[PDB]
Amino acid sequence: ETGIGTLIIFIAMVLVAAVAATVLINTAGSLQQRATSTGSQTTNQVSTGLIVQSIYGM
């Protein structure tokens, strides 16, 4: 009967959907750390600087 064949494919459908879910989570986690670090590094880059007061010679 059709009942047996339906159950077999059902298991396969669940496993496939889990794979595509894993890709999206892993990619978002990788891009999270890069975007956070870039923002913090740029903030330090703009604000920091050195200034010359006076120059003397002998």
């Binding site: 894993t22 989570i25 892993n26 986690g29 990788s30 999270q32 750390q33 670090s37």
Partner: protein
């Protein structure tokens, strides 16, 4: 270690008692430093509304928060300036937590935020 009532210093839990040196001991006189080595990490509880976290069964539930302490001087022999650190916290079931940071160019203060 349990520290849910609040603390003035987090890094003070290193002196906290975990066990007894002898059977004649009145109080827990084995410190947390002595059991934390190069292969293991320590768990410090911050919040547990469900009371699900114990030493025998450290089960993390909804609304709970923990601190993981790593003896860096034992594992790597001290982390240095301007070095990249990458890692993961892998559970048995679920998606992992991501650790990625670069250590500051110059250590100017005692306690620093990394990530």
């Amino acid at each position: 270690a349990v520290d849910t009532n609040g603390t003035s210093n987090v890094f003070s839990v290193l002196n906290a008692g975990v066990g007894y040196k002898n059977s004649t001991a009145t109080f827990k006189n084995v410190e947390l430093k002595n059991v934390t080595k190069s292969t293991n990490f320590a768990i410090v509880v911050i919040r547990d509304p469900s009371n699900s976290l114990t030493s025998s069964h450290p089960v993390l539930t909804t609304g709970s928060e923990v601190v993981i302490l790593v003896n860096t001087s034992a594992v790597f022999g001290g982390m240095k300036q301007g070095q990249a650190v990458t890692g993961q916290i892998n559970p048995s079931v679920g998606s992992p937590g991501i650790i990625q940071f670069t250590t500051p160019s110059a250590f100017t203060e005692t306690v620093m935020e990394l990530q």
